[PDB]
């Protein structure tokens, strides 16, 4: 069979690569939201701890990949960290994650308390927290969670290891009940499809918001026709306490619009509880100069912060949903060796390349930003501009 250190040789600079691209792309992002204080909010207080995440890959997961991947003889506890350590930044990557949906979920449906409630302070004591779960979760194994009682020693004498080691090999110090059920399963699968039901409710909340306000619109100018084609005072009547409700439901340079837009709904409906019919129905038209010059650029702005938190959420989104596809490949391998061992086990190659893959996703979330945010994007430009 060929020498194994030809297709060592392969993925080794692969991975090396990937870990050089990792670090650039994410202290791109860093240096980008350290110097642009529009970059500054709670949101991406999490996108930082996203990009130090894949930073660490870099400069040490795809490192220990590399190790782990030789066989050397190494004791069995240490040989669990470099292997388990990798999942401790992946963990921190899901909470990021779902921090980040969350966040975006409170801020489209309480718009009013996010400033109060999701704030830079409690934003940096939940990264911290997550941390440490992330920390606890990954290394579970160290805590006894592992194949460290029941050595490969055929293996490790064919390899000459001291006495107390093993061949250092993934596969052969963590557990793969811990990996299907725990961190695949428990870990990884449910947190995503949670953070898939956020958005989906932050997708459906805009689209009721967006709904609800161009239906008010609509209120507004139909009962303003009802108002020119009646001749009949209780009409007029009837169709301004609905005109009234619907603009004190819209409300919640802009105050003063309102104002007058209401104003000129109780100028007209009290001549309407007069009689005055034609009275009336020509104080009703002084609305319509005050929606054309207020109301429609309400409609307007509110219209365009919605789709721009729609488009926003897309965006966190894609995210999501290349981590799914970057992970996915290796989980679904360890459940076909696990849950199949019929079986044949999938060819080394093939578990090289689901390992090169997970770790590509260290390599995207850089590119999303600057294709998709334009903020990140400028940002991106000035300083590989002024630097490079
Ligand atoms: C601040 C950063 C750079 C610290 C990096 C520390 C890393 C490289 C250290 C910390 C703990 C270390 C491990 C501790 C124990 C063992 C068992 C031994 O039989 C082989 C080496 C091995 C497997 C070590 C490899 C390197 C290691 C993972
Ligand atoms: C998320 C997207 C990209 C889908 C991922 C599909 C991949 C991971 C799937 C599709 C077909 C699968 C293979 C189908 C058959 C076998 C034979 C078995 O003896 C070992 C596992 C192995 C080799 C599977 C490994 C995982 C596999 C390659
Ligand atoms: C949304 C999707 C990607 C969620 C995850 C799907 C996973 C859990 C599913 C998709 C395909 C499934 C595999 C399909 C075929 C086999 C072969 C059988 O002998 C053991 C179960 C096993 C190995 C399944 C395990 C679970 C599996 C890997
Ligand atoms: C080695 C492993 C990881 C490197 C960690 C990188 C840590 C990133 C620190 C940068 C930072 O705080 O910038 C964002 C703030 O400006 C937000 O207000
Ligand atoms: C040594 C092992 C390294 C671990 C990963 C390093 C993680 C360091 C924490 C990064 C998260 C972060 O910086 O979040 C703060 C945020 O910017 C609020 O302003
Ligand atoms: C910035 C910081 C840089 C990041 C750290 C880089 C590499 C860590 C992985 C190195 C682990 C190598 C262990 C090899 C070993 O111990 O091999 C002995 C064995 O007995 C057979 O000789
Ligand atoms: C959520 C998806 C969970 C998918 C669960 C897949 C379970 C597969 C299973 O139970 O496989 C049994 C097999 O017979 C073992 O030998
Ligand atoms: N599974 C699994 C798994 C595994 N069997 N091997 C390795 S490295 C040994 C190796 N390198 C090339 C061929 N074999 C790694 C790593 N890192 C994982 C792994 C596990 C969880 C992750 O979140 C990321 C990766
Ligand atoms: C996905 C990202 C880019 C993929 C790059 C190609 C994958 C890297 C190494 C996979 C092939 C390594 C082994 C080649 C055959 C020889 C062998 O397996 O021993
Ligand atoms: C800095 C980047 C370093 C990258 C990888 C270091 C890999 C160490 C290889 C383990 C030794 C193999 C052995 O002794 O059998
Ligand atoms: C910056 C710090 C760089 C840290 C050192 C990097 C990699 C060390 C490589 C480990 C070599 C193992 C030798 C194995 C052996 O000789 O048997």
Wanted: hydrophobic residues 50%; aromatic residues 10%.
């Amino acid at each position: 069979g060929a020498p194994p250190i030809m297709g060592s040789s392969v993925y080794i600079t692969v991975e090396l690569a990937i870990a050089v691209l990792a670090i650039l792309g994410n202290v791109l992002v860093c240096w980008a939201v350290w110097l642009n204080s529009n970059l500054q909010n709670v949101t991406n207080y999490f996108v930082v701890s996203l990009a130090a995440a894949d930073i660490a890959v870099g400069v040490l997961a795809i490192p220990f990949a590399i190790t782990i991947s030789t066989g050397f003889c190494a004791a069995c506890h240490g040989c669990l960290f470099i292997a388990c350590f990798v999942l401790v930044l992946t963990q921190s990557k899901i909470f990021s994650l779902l921090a980040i949906a969350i966040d975006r979920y409170i801020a489209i449906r309480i718009p009013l308390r996010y400033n109060g409630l999701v704030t830079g302070t409690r934003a940096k004591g939940i990264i911290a927290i997550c941390w440490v779960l992330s920390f606890a979760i990954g290394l579970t194994p160290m805590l006894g969670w592992n194949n460290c009682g029941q050595p490969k020693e055929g293996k490790a004498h064919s390899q000459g290891c001291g006495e107390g080691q093993v061949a250092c090999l993934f596969e052969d110090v963590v557990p793969m009940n811990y990996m299907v059920y725990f961190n695949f399963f428990a870990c990884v699968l449910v947190p995503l499809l949670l953070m898939l039901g956020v958005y989906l409710r932050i997708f459906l909340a805009a689209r009721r918001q967006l709904a609800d306000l161009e239906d008010n619109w609509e209120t507004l100018n139909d009962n303003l026709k009802v108002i020119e084609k009646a001749d009949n005072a209780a009409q007029v009547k009837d169709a301004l306490t609905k005109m009234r409700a619907a603009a004190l439901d819209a409300q919640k340079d802009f105050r003063h619009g309102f104002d007058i837009l209401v104003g000129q709904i109780d100028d007209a409906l009290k001549l309407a509880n007069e009689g005055k019919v034609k009275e009336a129905q020509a104080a009703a038209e002084q609305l319509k100069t005050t929606r054309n010059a207020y109301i429609q650029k309400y409609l307007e702005r509110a219209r365009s912060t919605l789709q721009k938190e729609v488009h926003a959420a897309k965006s966190l989104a894609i995210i999501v949903g290349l981590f799914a596809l970057c992970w996915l490949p290796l989980h679904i391998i360890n459940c076909f060796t696990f849950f199949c061992p019929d079986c044949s086990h999938a060819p080394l190659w093939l578990m090289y390349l689901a390992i090169v893959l997970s770790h590509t996703n260290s390599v995207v979330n850089p590119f999303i930003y600057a294709y998709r945010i334009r903020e990140f994007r400028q940002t991106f430009r000035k300083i590989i501009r002024s630097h490079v």
